[PDB]
Ligand binder design. Structure first.
Ligand SMILES: O=c1[nH]c(=O)c2nc[nH]c2[nH]1
Length: 167
């Protein structure tokens, strides 16, 4: 048993809810919250801007030190950092950004990072301002992630479309 509430079960391991990933993290304090990161860990907008704002910029301060030491992530890659006030850990995952020309085939590699964690609270990778089709992102999630993933879809209208169209 875990503390996630009000999710619709899609598969053996994937759950979905119309919820802000921020408010959900604050309520649940999951072991792992996923950030929709970029390779620079510059948390300006979308999931990254909202999560970072909720940490009072501490996420950005930690991230800048990580990049200064390690250099940029790979598209499709990840790193584990603090979850600050939101979670034990934040898994910063870089899905391809279609609005920058990145290979959508990298979305499967991005979701493979989730398999290193038994349970996660996550957004749909490469959705929103990353420009991918969220229906596609949910299909890759279901077909790639084998650990237990709780998906927080911000947009009520999109949530209903994702559920209604789910195969
Ligand atoms: O503020 C937010 N922005 C988002 O893009 C998002 N996705 C899930 N939950 C979210 N909250």
């Amino acid at each position: 048993v875990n503390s996630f509430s009000g999710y619709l079960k899609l598969t053996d391991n994937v759950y979905i809810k119309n919820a802000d990933i921020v408010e959900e993290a604050k309520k649940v304090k999951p072991t792992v919250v996923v950030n929709a990161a970029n390779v620079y860990l510059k948390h300006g907008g979308g999931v990254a801007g909202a999560l970072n704002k909720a940490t009072n910029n501490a996420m950005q301060v930690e991230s800048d030190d990580y990049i200064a030491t390690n250099g940029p992530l790979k598209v499709g890659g990840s790193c584990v950092l603090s979850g600050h006030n939101l979670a034990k850990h934040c898994l910063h995952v870089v899905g391809p950004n279609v609005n920058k020309g990145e290979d959508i085939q990298l979305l499967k590699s991005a979701y493979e990072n989730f398999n290193q964690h038994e349970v996660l609270l996550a957004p749909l990778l490469s959705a929103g301002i990353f420009g991918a089709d969220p229906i596609h992102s949910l299909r890759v999630c279901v077909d790639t992630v084998r650990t237990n993933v709780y998906l927080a879809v911000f947009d009520k209208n999109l949530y209903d479309k994702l559920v209604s169209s789910f195969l």
